[PDB]
Design a protein around this ligand. Structure first.
Ligand SMILES: Cc1cc2nc3c(=O)[nH]c(=O)nc-3n(C[C@H](O)[C@H](O)[C@H](O)COP(=O)(O)OP(=O)(O)OC[C@H]3O[C@@H](n4cnc5c(N)ncnc54)[C@H](O)[C@@H]3O)c2cc1C
Ligand SMILES: NC(=O)[C@H]1C=[N+]([C@@H]2O[C@H](COP(=O)(O)OP(=O)(O)OC[C@H]3O[C@@H](n4cnc5c(N)ncnc54)[C@H](OP(=O)(O)O)[C@@H]3O)[C@@H](O)[C@H]2O)C=CC1=O
Length: 452
């Protein structure tokens, strides 16, 4: 028999793991593999579909690689299966030789400041999910009619949020952005987005192409006050690294530009949100100035000066990181929002593993998940081999039984063939309108088409 591996999730780390498993089988005598991928949503691809911005279609093409893996007869997909709800980790661990958790980071990091729960104060997780038609975020429905939005954070997701808020809706109308978001964006209510970083430009997590792209936003001026660069030296930037060096060149270019009448994307560094205020909704934000100070760890940290400034704002989006969510039956590190592991094997388990953001934390481009997954898979395969040699493998038409069990637990599961129907529907909806697709934005609409 082949080894039977379950993979929980269908984003990049899941698909890289799947590919690594099948490659091992293809290149090793007396080693065969069967991979079942269980995905919470009706649709595969994780953040490649629901995270990557709608104006970033090019990198989404990595999905073709995932599709090629999914064509393998040894691979099966079961969508609309929520592990922790329909089936439990302890059940999967009985039915498979090994289980790989590739669940990513499904929630958000909080600021932990007063007013954070006011209507109008949301996380980028929820805003992005909403604009990308993720079914869990269909009702986020932010009010985008106010003149000023504030985005907290200095990673690339902060740039995505700011771009979507400020891009000409006629441009967004040719993307796969959610129709509900396009509708809210058409009035062009927001005139200024202020991106607020707690540390300085040299500590920014932005990457260079993404900063450069801002120059191509029709109708939008990028605003960086020259004072934001005082004390920011090319020497110090180069010492941080090559990306930082390039970033600072780009930021200097923006600061060199002086205009009434345009929408504005403003960068403020060395600033923290202290409190969000308003009568029943966000109306203003209190900001504090920081200075950089060595903390003894090898880095500089922001230290509050105690100074306070208030700025009117009607939307605050915190882009201060995604965050893992605990899975029933598995260990978890609250502080980091990751599952504790060693070389990808989960604590305390002989046959459960992690890959991707749930393993490493929520950082890295899509490709960073590849070596990560390979490393985990190598460990997994070594451990199976040891078990086989010790006559410690489970004894298992097992593939049929497990599929029947999945169908008993989730009669509305979505197979690969039915995802392909969803996919075709969405693409055919978009192409006549110049869009790659129009997404089905709720579970009900996805299932209307997918189970059909
Ligand atoms: C907003 C945003 C934009 C990004 N843009 C880019 C970009 O332009 N370029 C780039 O290279 N990288 C980009 N990234 C990074 C990229 O998205 C990540 O590196 C990558 O998607 C992480 O992969 P993952 O497999 O760990 O998690 P994910 O892609 O999050 O996949 C996790 C999957 O697990 C599923 N799942 C979760 N819990 C369960 C459960 N209990 N049961 C079943 N299934 C479950 C989820 O539904 C999801 O499909 C972006 C990230 C974000 C957040
Ligand atoms: N085109 C691309 O390559 C893209 C790549 N991604 C990539 O996805 C991941 C996740 O991006 P995301 O922006 O969510 O996270 P990071 O890059 O870690 O940035 C987090 C920022 O949040 C900041 N942060 C965290 N806590 C706070 C508090 N309390 N107050 C203020 N600011 C805070 C953090 O600041 P810090 O460096 O810790 O001082 C980062 O600027 C990251 O690796 C990205 O580069 C995301 C979008 C892309 O477009």
């Amino acid at each position: 028999r082949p080894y039977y591996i379950a993979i929980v999730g269908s984003g990049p780390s899941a698909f890289f793991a799947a590919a690594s498993l099948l490659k091992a089988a293809d290149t090793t005598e007396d080693l065969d593999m069967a991979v079942d991928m269980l995905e919470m949503l009706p649709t595969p691809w994780g953040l490649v579909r629901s995270g990557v911005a709608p104006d970033h279609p090019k990198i989404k093409s990595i999905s073709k690689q995932f599709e090629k893996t999914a064509e393998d007869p040894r691979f099966r997909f079961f969508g609309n299966v929520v592990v922790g709800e329909h089936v439990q980790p302890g059940e999967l661990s009985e039915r498979y030789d090994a289980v790989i958790y590739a669940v990513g980071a499904q929630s958000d990091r909080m600021l932990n400041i007063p007013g954070e729960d006011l209507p109008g104060s949301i996380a980028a997780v929820d805003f992005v999910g909403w604009y990308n038609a993720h079914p869990h975020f269909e009702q986020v429905s932010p009010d985008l009619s106010g003149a000023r939005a504030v985005v907290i954070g200095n990673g690339n997701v902060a740039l995505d949020v700011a771009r979507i808020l400020l891009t000409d809706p006629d441009v967004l109308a040719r993307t796969d952005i959610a129709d509900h978001a396009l509708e809210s964006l058409r009035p062009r209510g927001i005139q200024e987005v202020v991106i607020v970083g707690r540390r300085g430009p040299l500590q920014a997590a932005f990457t260079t192409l993404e900063l450069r792209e801002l120059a191509d936003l029709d109708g939008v001026d990028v605003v960086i006050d020259p004072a934001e660069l005082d004390g920011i030296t090319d020497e110090d930037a180069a010492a941080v690294g090559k990306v930082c060096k390039q970033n600072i060149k780009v930021l200097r270019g923006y600061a060199d530009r002086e205009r009434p009448g345009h929408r504005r994307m403003v960068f403020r560094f060395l600033t923290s949100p202290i409190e969000i205020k308003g009568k029943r909704k966000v109306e203003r934000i209190v900001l504090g100035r920081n200075e950089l100070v060595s903390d003894g760890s090898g880095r500089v940290a922001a230290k509050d000066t105690g100074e306070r400034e208030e700025l009117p704002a009607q939307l605050v989006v915190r882009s201060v990181g995604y965050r893992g969510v605990p899975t029933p039956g598995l260990p978890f590190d609250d502080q980091s929002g990751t599952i504790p592991n060693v070389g990808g094997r989960i604590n305390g388990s002989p046959n459960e593993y992690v890959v991707g953001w749930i393993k490493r934390g929520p950082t890295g481009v899509i490709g960073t998940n590849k070596k990560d997954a390979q490393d985990t898979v190598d460990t997994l395969i070594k451990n199976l081999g040891n078990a086989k040699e010790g006559a410690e493998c489970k004894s298992f038409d097992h593939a049929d039984q497990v599929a029947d069990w999945l169908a008993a637990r989730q009669p509305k599961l979505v197979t690969s063939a039915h995802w392909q129907v969803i996919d075709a529907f969405e693409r055919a909806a978009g192409e006549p309108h110049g869009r790659p697709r129009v997404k089905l934005a709720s579970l009900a609409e996805l299932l209307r088409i997918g189970l059909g």
